[PDB]
Amino acid sequence: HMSYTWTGALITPCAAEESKLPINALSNSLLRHHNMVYATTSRSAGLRQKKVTFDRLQVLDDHYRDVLKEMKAKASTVKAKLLSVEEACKLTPPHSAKSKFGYGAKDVRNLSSKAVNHIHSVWKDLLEDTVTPIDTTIMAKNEVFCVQRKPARLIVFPDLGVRVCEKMALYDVVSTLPQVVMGSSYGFQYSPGQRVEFLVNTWKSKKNPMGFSYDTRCFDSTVTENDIRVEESIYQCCDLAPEARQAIKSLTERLYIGGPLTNSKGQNCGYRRCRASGVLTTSCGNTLTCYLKASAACRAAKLQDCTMLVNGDDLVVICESAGTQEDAASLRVFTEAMTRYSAPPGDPPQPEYDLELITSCSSNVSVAHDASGKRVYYLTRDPTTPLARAAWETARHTPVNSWLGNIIMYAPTLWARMILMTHFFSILLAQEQLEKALDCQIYGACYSIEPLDLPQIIERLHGLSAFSLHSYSPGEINRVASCLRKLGVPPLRVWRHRARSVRARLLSQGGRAATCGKYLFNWAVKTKLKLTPIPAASRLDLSGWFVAGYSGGDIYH
Ligand SMILES: CS(=O)(=O)Nc1ccc2c(c1)S(=O)(=O)C=C(c1c(O)c3cc(F)ccc3n(Cc3ccc(F)cc3)c1=O)N2
Ligand code: NI
Fold first, then answer.
1. DSSP structure string for 499-552
2. 186 lines ligand 1 (CB under 6 A)
3. Domains along the chain with CATH numbers
4. Which one, 1, 107, 385, 442, has least CB within 10 Å?
5. Beta strand extents in 42-133 (DSSP E only)
6. Nearest residue by C-alpha to atom 14 in ligand 1
């Protein structure tokens, strides 16, 4: 029962790979310690292969089957529809990997004849053949970190023609089913404002709260054939067209359960019997399987008044404390149960009695004060990786702009406002590119976003208080200051000074640019404008935001 078998062929790059931080004239204004930042490359793929390759053992008890029965009962209330070829085509990212069969992502989006023709042949084949393993490409992801060096993560995906077919069969299912089955525990339904409120209200709902995050070592590799057949049984509980059932069975047997791995040169690298990281059902599958195992493990452990929050493989549990000793015992049982279910821990779980000390979806709750002095909770994180990536994106154009996703998701934080907003608007001013739409990724989906829309986007996700926060916590101030020292980033007093300049320049231009100056940089000026609700921030179409997760799912909105 091995996650992978290997031939010995190497995982190969598609193009040249830089590992050292590229430097330009803008670099030093963000960060001086350039040797701290690196990107992963295929050169480390072998170490990752070793990490992700292990034997899985699975022992399944009555708690597991009881939870599954209840999930299936909820799944049976879902009705999902087939997407048409063109609906599915318009969900494809413009810079998605081209097909091996002589067509690309733009041909798919234009509904060109050769793309549409091939897609129909793949669909027909899915319907006739439920046995032949489908080919996947395996690649090393190039991602940017700060030192303490990780090996490249691996992405496994099928051909573009198959991906469009997955959308036809499954897009409506993976978008709709998770919230029906998990209700309030499904994380991807929440904007950042709604996530913080949920965590705080849950913490507050317990007489004596205790919470913990659970880190599964290599979740994707822990997913067994059983787990993936179990997901399919859940999907099949939905009210589906007969053609959708046949396609889902087929993709399950031929793709989701496993298949051969091919490098960028077309050589055979080996074989997969675990979760593929680049299929449509990666996020929904991981979410269902994480929630199933964790729910069953909560019962095994006898945790009292358990509330879970689940985003794929990321899990937080908040419950009633039974004292520090019985809590420690409960968590050992939880971890033994997950372990028997094929989800052993990386870092073993710790009981926490302070909400601010729990990290989940790479983020912790912290507290600041708005214009009225009233306390507001908001989500933050250690800004090291966000700033290392902004350093890279200062000297190189990248298809996805992490600085922009980070401003969107962490708008209330002191580091996003002072450093990220200041640095990148100054860059957009100097190049006259304020009006140019940029791509970023939120909950695995790709979005085209106009930066001049940032203030409306932020008021909607966070509320106006995001533009007025002050008096941040000492732990948060210390973590930021600590990151600025490590990376060699200029002090917050230098950023305030630049932000005054950026602000005044934005005000000069009027329109949406002036509104950015006013809302985004109100913190920079000695005596503040009283900010009021933005007119445009009621007209933005944020539908298709905070519905579901789509990690590796090749989704564009
Ligand atoms: C592979 S899996 O099994 O599905 N696991 C998985 C777990 C979490 C997660 C994703 C996948 S995602 O790929 O769907 C993107 C986010 C994810 C983002 O796309 C995101 C983007 C930003 F630009 C800034 C912060 C972000 N945060 C942190 C965050 C989450 C929620 C908040 F309210 C605020 C920050 C995320 O977790 N979360
Ligand atoms: Ni029972």
1. HHHHHHHHHHT-HHHHHHHHHHTGGGSSS-------SGGGT---TTSSS---TT
2. no
3. 1-55+133-158+258-273 (no CATH), 56-132+159-182+224-257+274-280 (no CATH), 183-223+281-361 (3.30.70.270), 362-557 (no CATH)
4. 1
5. none
6. 443
> How far is 535 from 145, CA to CA, in rounded Å?
39
DSSP string, 134-151: PPEEEEE---EEE---PP
CB 548 within 8 A of CB 469: no
Which residue in this structure is represented by tokens 């590796």? Answer: 552
Q: How far is the centre of ligand 1, averaged over its atoms, from the C-alpha of 498 (Å)?
A: 30
Written as six digits, the tokens of 331 are 């968590």
Which residue(s) pair with 368 in the sheet? 376
Does residue 314 have its Cβ closer than 6 Å to ligand 1? Answer: yes
Q: Name, in order, each residue with C-beta under 8 angstroms of 348's C-beta and a sequence gap of 6 or more.
A: 335
Q: Structure resolution in Å?
A: 2.2
Atom of ligand 1 nearest to the CA of 549: 14
Residue 285's nearest CA partner among 444, 432, 150 is: 444
Residues, the chain: 557
409 lines ligand 1 (CB under 6 A): yes
Ligand 1 near 313 CB (within 6 A): yes
Experimental method: X-ray
Most informative mutation of 213, 409, 545, 555 for ligand 1 (most atoms within 8 A of CB): 409
> Under a CB-based contact definition with an 8 Å cutoff, are residues 182 and 302 in contact?
no
The set of long-range contacts for 511-515, using a CB threshold of 8 Å and a minimum separation of 24, is: 511/452, 512/434, 512/452, 512/453, 512/536, 513/434, 513/452, 515/452, 515/455
Number of helices followed by number of strands (H, E) in the chain:
21, 14
